[PDB]
């Protein structure tokens, strides 16, 4: 079918059809252009007109221009031949390595797995990161979220996890760059090549890359997540594969939505966001999941605007995760990295019947002492410690030593910590924290605990501090 | 009070002695001592 462009406003192109109106979600190709311009139908305004969302800049379009119904929704190359390749929202390669020659093609809009298809196995995923492992442990096939205001550690934490987990993972990985920096895509691609997870020589690549960055028009940013998502769904269900899915940043998808929403003509909801915010997050978040057919461990970075976690975007995302790592500017500014807020991160696995009571008791032990320190802080703030009780001052000592021992050097952040990256084994974490709690190091100085791996290194640092 | 750790310091060292030790009897000059290294050792005043 051939329609005609009737109106153009930014990324919202209205096209009229005479015979055969395309259903909603169908991709149309604008005619008469140097490059592909896909339009995704969004709604039937009546009068044989359809309101659509462009997938690329709309400059140059002209009213009356011809548009062709592709007959289906954006469809993209899916299969193992996407492994080691970089692709677009609309599935075209952007790594200058030729066509992605796949047997099948999948449409980016699918329904979420049914209730009966759900899984409930809960396995802990150890990452080697002290704070995460001890207090808000991730889980295989689970949904993890790293909340962070600008420049707090979301990406560095994804990188370190890619390093500590993705690197020795049997099975595939999918990295979906949504609304982030292009240089980062470039930094990663080349790094992936270097460590050999991307091999441009053989078919041994274990990563497929999808990108729709900070330079794309809203509609592209609004759909690349769906695109990375689809790639991952193929490995899960069509190959019963154990997938790893990294997304930086899923907040950008929602923001993209807010960008076009006025153009679609909708009364805004709170904070200027689109009234369809939750459902849009929902039908999308619900496909990022493990099932009986396959496993999807997904780590999603969630940018928090103005640092406000009460913002509709981040606020609505908590409910979709199994584990959350809430990063803090306040902590970061103290020099503690990763800047994880220990009393604000959680994990549905923090259950005695899953991590064992030893783990469950150290974990709750650490939080209780930090919570206690937290209430003393108001008074410590005007009057310092003098007036504090001998007992209270011991919580304070221990809390400040536990707070420091929660920090740790990442390989990925070596250039900034000035120290060699460390990976601490769970039992080493459970332990080191026990002792601290138990008063076995009340003699060491705080600084001994800052930026170290295992407790054994904290004792040493103390000697060096003399 | 409101002089940092003036009192807590002497008290801290005061309890330390009474423990390590020979009969024990004590005197405190300045009400603060009589309120701090106290209760535990009133029957030791």
Question: Which DSSP string do the residues of A279-304 spell out, in sequence order?
Answer: HHHHHHHTTSS--SS-EEEEEEEEE-
Q: What SS3 string covers A319-350? A: HHCCEEEEECHHHHHHCCCCCECCCCCEECCC
Beta-sheet pairing, A323-326 with A143-148: parallel
Q: For residue A176, what are the β-bridge partners? A: A210, A247
Catalytic status, residue A154: yes
Residues of B with CB under 8 A from a CB of A: 1-5, 8, 12
Chain A residues near residue B8 by CB distance under 8 angstroms = 386, 390
Beta-sheet pairing, A138-140 with A207-212: unpaired
DSSP letter (8 states) at residue A78? E
Q: Residue A124 belongs to what H/E stretch?
A: strand A123-125
Distance CA A271, CA A313 (A): 10
Q: For residue A13, what are the β-bridge partners? A: A8, A52
Does A224 appear as a known binding residue? no
Burial A157-169 (b: 16+ CB within 10 A, else e): bbbbbbbbbbeee
DSSP letter (8 states) at residue A193? H
Report which of A67, A72, A74, A90 is spatially closest to residue A23, judged by C-alpha positions: A72
Which of the four CATH numbers 3.40.50.1100, 3.40.50.300, 3.30.830.10, 2.60.120.200 does domain A74-349 have?
A: 3.40.50.300
| For testing contact with chain A, the best of B1, B3, B4, B36 (most A CBs within 10 A) | B4
Report which of A283, A285, A291, A281 is spatially closest to residue A255, judged by C-alpha positions: A281
Chain B residues near residue A386 by CB distance under 8 angstroms = 3-5, 8
Which entry of A140, A167, A181, A293 is annotated as an active-site residue?
A181
Which entry of A40, A180, A216, A233 is annotated as an active-site residue?
A180
Residues of chain A with CATH 2.40.10.170: 1-73
Q: Three-class SS of residue A353?
A: helix
Does A254 appear as a known binding residue? no
Render A408-443 in DSSP notation, one character per residue: ---GGGHHHHSS------HHHHHHHHHHHHTTTTTT
DSSP letter (8 states) at residue A240? -
Whether domain A1-73 has CATH 1.10.3720.10: the reply is: no
Distance CA A404, CA A336 (A): 7
Residues of chain A with CATH 3.40.50.300: 74-349
A244 phi/psi in degrees, rounded to 5: -125, 125
Distance CA A178, CA A218 (A): 11
The tokens describing A281, both together, are: 């997050």
**Total Cβ atoms within 10 A of residue A237:** 17
Distance CA A50, CA A44 (A): 5
**Total Cβ atoms within 10 A of residue A63:** 10
Does A156 appear as a known binding residue? yes
In B, minimum Cα distance to A385 occurs at B4
Long-range CB contact pairs, B3-10, < 8 A, 24+ = B3/A386, B4/A384, B4/A386, B5/A386, B7/B32, B7/B33, B7/B36, B8/A386, B8/A390, B8/B36, B10/B37
Distance CA A324, CA A194 (A): 30
Across the interface, whether the CB atoms of A390 and B12 are under 8 A apart is answered yes
Chain A residues near residue B1 by CB distance under 8 angstroms = 387
What is the residue whose two structure tokens read 């028009």? Answer: A217
Q: Count H helices, E strands: chain B?
A: 2, 0
Q: Which CATH class is domain A350-466?
A: mainly alpha
Beta-sheet pairing, A143-148 with A173-178: unpaired
Distance CA A226, CA A53 (A): 15
Does A325 appear as a known binding residue? no
- Return the ∠ at Cα A192 (arms to A189 and A194), rounded to 5°: 110
Q: Is A106 in contact with A237 (CB distance < 8 Å)? A: no
Resolution for this PDB entry, in angstroms: 5.0
Task: Give the HSE-up count for residue A61: Cα atoms under 13 Å, Cβ half-sphere.
Answer: 29
Report which of A253, A355, A264, A369 is spatially closest to residue A313, judged by C-alpha positions: A253
DSSP letter (8 states) at residue A93? B
Q: Is A121 left (phi over 0), alpha (psi -120 to 50) or beta?
A: beta
Q: Residue A51 belongs to what H/E stretch?
A: strand A49-54
Burial A129-154 (b: 16+ CB within 10 A, else e): bbbbbbbbbbbebbbbbbbbbeebbb
In A, minimum Cα distance to B11 occurs at A390
The tokens describing A293, both together, are: 């057919």
Report which of A27, A24, A48, A21 is spatially closest to residue A39, judged by C-alpha positions: A27
Distance CA A177, CA A224 (A): 8
Across the interface, whether the CB atoms of A387 and B1 are under 8 A apart is answered yes
The tokens describing A49, both together, are: 């007109």
CB-based contacts of A266, cutoff 8 Å, min separation 6 = A274, A275, A276
What is the residue whose two structure tokens read 């760059």? Answer: A177
Q: For residue A248, what are the β-bridge partners? A: A177, A301
Q: Is A421 left (phi over 0), alpha (psi -120 to 50) or beta?
A: beta
Distance CA A29, CA A66 (A): 9
DSSP letter (8 states) at residue A160? H
Chain A residues near residue B5 by CB distance under 8 angstroms = 386
What is the residue whose two structure tokens read 């149309």? Answer: A28
- Return the ∠ at Cα A129 (arms to A241 and A452), rounded to 5°: 150
Report which of A182, A189, A251, A165 is spatially closest to residue A216, judged by C-alpha positions: A182
Distance CA A165, CA A151 (A): 23
Residues of chain A with CATH 1.10.1140.10: 350-466
Distance CA A127, CA A164 (A): 6
CB pairs under 8 A between A and B: 9
Q: Three-class SS of residue B30?
A: coil
Q: For residue A49, what are the β-bridge partners? A: A16, A46
A440 to chain B, closest Cα gap in Å = 20
Instruction: Return the beta strands (E) in A213-252 as ranges.
Output: 242-248
Does A153 appear as a known binding residue? yes
A382 phi/psi in degrees, rounded to 5: -100, -50
Which residue in the set B2, B3, B8 is minimally distant from A390, CB to CB?
B8
A140 phi/psi in degrees, rounded to 5: -55, 135
Across the interface, whether the CB atoms of A386 and B12 are under 8 A apart is answered no
CA A394, A400, A403, A406 torsion-angle sign: negative
What is the residue whose two structure tokens read 């990256």? Answer: A421
Q: Is A304 in contact with A317 (CB distance < 8 Å)? A: no
Long-range CB contact pairs, A376-380, < 8 A, 24+ = none
């Amino acid at each position: 079918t051939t329609g005609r462009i009737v109106a153009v406003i930014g990324a919202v192109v209205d096209v009229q059809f005479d015979e055969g109106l395309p259903p909603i979600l169908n991709a149309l190709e604008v005619q008469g252009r140097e490059t592909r311009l896909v339009l995704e139908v969004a709604q039937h305004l009546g009068e044989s007109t359809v309101r659509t969302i462009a997938m690329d800049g709309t400059e140059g379009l002209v009213r009356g221009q011809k548009v062709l119904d592709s007959g289906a929704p954006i469809r993209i190359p899916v299969g193992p031949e996407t492994l080691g390749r970089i692709m677009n929202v609309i599935g075209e390669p952007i790594d200058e390595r030729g066509p992605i020659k796949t047997k099948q093609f999948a449409a980016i809009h699918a329904e979420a797995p049914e209730f009966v298809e759900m899984s409930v196995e809960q396995e802990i995923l150890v990452t080697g990161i002290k704070v995460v492992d001890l207090l808000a442990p991730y889980a295989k096939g689970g949904k993890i979220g790293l909340f962070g205001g600008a420049g707090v550690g979301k990406t560095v934490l994804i990188m370190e996890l890619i390093n500590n987990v993705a690197k020795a993972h049997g099975g595939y990985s999918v990295f979906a760059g949504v609304g982030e920096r292009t240089r980062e895509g470039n930094d990663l691609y080349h790094e992936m090549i270097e460590s050999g997870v991307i091999n441009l020589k053989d078919a041994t690549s274990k990563v497929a890359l999808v990108y729709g960055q900070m330079n794309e028009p809203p509609g592209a940013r609004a759909r690349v997540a769906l695109t990375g998502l689809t790639v991952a769904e193929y490995f899960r269900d069509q190959e019963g594969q154990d997938v790893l899915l990294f997304i930086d940043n899923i907040f950008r998808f929602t923001q993209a939505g807010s960008e076009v929403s006025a153009l679609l003509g909708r009364i805004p909801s709170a904070v200027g966001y689109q009234p369809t915010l939750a459902t849009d997050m929902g039908t999308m978040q619900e496909r990022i999941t493990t099932t009986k057919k396959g496993s999807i461990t997904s780590v999603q970075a969630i940018y928090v605007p103005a640092d406000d976690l009460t913002d509709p975007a981040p606020a609505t995302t908590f409910a979709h995760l199994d584990a959350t790592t809430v990063l803090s500017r306040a902590i970061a500014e103290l020099g503690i990295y990763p800047a994880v807020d220990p009393l604000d991160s959680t994990s549905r696995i923090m259950d005695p019947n899953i991590v064992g009571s030893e783990h469950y008791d150290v974990a709750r032990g650490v939080q209780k002492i930090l919570q206690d320190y937290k209430s003393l802080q108001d008074i410590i703030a005007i009057l310092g410690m003098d007036e504090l009780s001998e007992e209270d001052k011991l919580t304070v000592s221990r809390a400040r030593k536990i707070q420091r021992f929660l920090s740790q050097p990442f390989q990925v952040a070596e250039v900034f910590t000035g120290h060699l990256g460390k990976l601490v084994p769970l039992k080493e974490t459970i332990k080191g924290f026990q002792q601290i709690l138990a008063g076995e190091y009340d003699h060491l100085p705080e600084q001994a605990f800052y930026m170290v791996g295992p407790i054994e290194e904290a004792v040493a640092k103390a000697d060096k501090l003399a | 009070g409101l002089c940092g750790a003036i009192h807590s310091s002497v008290a801290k060292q005061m309890k330390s002695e009474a423990a390590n030790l020979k009969e024990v009897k004590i005197i405190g000059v300045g009400d603060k001592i009589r309120s701090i290294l106290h209760r535990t050792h009133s029957d030791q005043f």
